[PDB]
């Protein structure tokens, strides 16, 4: 049965330029029982594939949707399968999320925490709110780059954590209506240059002074 599955999954390849350059990307799906990833067929297909996305029920109930466990989910290809923009805005994400997950035990003692510890806690909460996504609503890569730039660039520290989602959406909406040239540069150049970063930052500042939170206060620093 390991042969049954490996024979199938080893045909998803990336051919050479001498063979045409075609490719077949495989997305197998495995249903564990009670999160028993150590079962037989889960073990086999985890051993075969190049990376795993572990979706969990506890995370799903906590409102984290897609319920991906970013702690144990891995991709052995890595940044080699990312555009330079996404490769650089998402490098500042894994460490931040790990620090948040190791600090979230002190979520109720931010008074006793160092300033850097509390800053990491709040940034991690905003980042966890940033990776949520509705169902049947996929985003093109430049909008994801702008969203993760919001998250990792510090432009969400002024927004209440219960508003981040909305803010993100609205900002992208604004950029889909007013400043399309930023998204076009990120889409055609695959990178976020310094000029585009400055333009995006000032757009974020204007939007922030135009944004209305749900608590009533302004989101301006």
């Amino acid at each position: 049965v390991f042969y049954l599955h490996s024979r199938l999954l080893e045909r998803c390849a990336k051919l050479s330029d001498d063979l045409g350059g075609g490719s077949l990307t495989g997305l197998p799906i495995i249903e564990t029982k009670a999160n028993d990833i150590s079962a037989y067929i889960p073990t086999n297909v985890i051993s075969i594939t190049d990376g795993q996305c572990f979706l969990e029920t506890d995370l799903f109930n906590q409102g984290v949707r897609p319920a991906i466990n970013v702690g144990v989910s891995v991709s052995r290809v890595g940044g080699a399968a990312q555009i330079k923009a996404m490769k650089e805005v998402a490098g500042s994400l894994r460490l931040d999320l790990s620090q948040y997950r190791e600090l979230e035990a002190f979520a109720a003692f931010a008074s006793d925490l160092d300033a850097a510890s509390k800053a990491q806690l709040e940034r991690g909460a905003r980042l966890v709110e940033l990776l949520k996504q509705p169902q049947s609503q996929p985003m093109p890569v430049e909008e994801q780059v702008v969203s993760i730039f919001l998250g990792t660039g510090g432009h969400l520290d002024s927004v209440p954590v219960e508003d981040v989602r909305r803010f993100e959406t609205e900002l992208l909406d604004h950029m889909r209506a007013s400043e399309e040239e930023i998204l076009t540069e990120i889409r055609d150049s695959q990178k976020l240059t310094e000029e585009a970063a400055d333009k995006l930052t000032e757009v974020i500042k204007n939007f922030k002074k135009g944004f209305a939170a749900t608590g009533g206060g302004s989101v301006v620093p």
Binding site: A34, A105, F106, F109, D112
Partner: protein
């Protein structure tokens, strides 16, 4: 069904481990803060002590808080405990020292009278059917000088009177951060010990209005600053 049971037990024990590690680090921060408070409250105590001994040098040592009352019939013991209960044998050691003190008092014909500071002492003493004269709660972790003033006022008013012949305090002395020792102190009536001469041809002090009134007005302030230092040492010891 034991495998689901064991995985759930592992998850619960991991939660407990995380919580207790967080609590340990929080307690480290708070013991730093408590040591800060203690060493910031030391100097006023030193100065009032030296002013009190200067006054006593030329005073009429007949104040009720300074004289040994004949035929002692009662003793008022103030036991300093904690409110939160995730400490170790802290309150247990306090209660052991207080029981030893109660036995020392019964071996001298004195009925102990019980004042408590904290909820754990209240638990230990209501389960043992003690009648607690007056209790204080809510400030065993960050005590302010107003709490010390109130406690010491109640104690000295019970002394000068339903009435006691002396006052003791059972609290935890903090030292070296690795040993916190429960201690019984006798805070009243104060023992008069004539230590030295120190100064012979010394420039004599002027007292306004006079030495005796100043002395009898300063003694209760000395007792209450002693109770304050006791509360601070107990808070630091509880955090350790």
């Amino acid at each position: 069904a034991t495998l689901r049971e064991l995985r759930g037990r592992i998850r619960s024990a991991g939660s407990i481990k995380k919580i207790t590690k967080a609590q340990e680090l929080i307690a480290t921060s708070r013991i730093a803060r408590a040591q800060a408070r203690l060493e910031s409250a030391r100097p006023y105590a030193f100065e009032i002590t030296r002013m009190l001994t200067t006054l006593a040098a030329e005073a009429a040592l007949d104040h009720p808080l300074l004289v040994e009352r004949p035929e002692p019939k009662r003793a008022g013991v103030l036991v300093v405990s904690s409110d939160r209960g995730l400490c170790g044998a802290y309150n247990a050691n306090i209660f052991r020292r207080s029981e030893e003190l109660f036995s020392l008092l019964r071996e001298a014909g004195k009925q102990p009278v019980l004042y408590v500071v904290g909820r754990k002492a209240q638990n230990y003493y209501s389960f043992r059917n003690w009648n607690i004269t007056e209790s204080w709660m809510g400030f065993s972790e960050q005590p302010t000088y107003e709490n010390a003033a109130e406690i010491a006022s109640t104690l000295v008013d019970a002394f000068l009177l339903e009435g006691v012949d002396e006052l003791h305090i059972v609290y935890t002395e903090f030292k070296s951060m690795l040993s916190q020792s429960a201690e019984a102190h006798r805070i009243a009536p104060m023992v008069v010990e004539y230590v030295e001469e120190d100064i012979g041809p010394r420039t004599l002090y002027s007292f306004e209005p006079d030495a005796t009134m100043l002395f009898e007005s300063l003694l209760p302030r000395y007792l209450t600053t002693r109770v304050y230092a006791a509360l601070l040492e107990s808070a630091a010891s509880e955090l350790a």
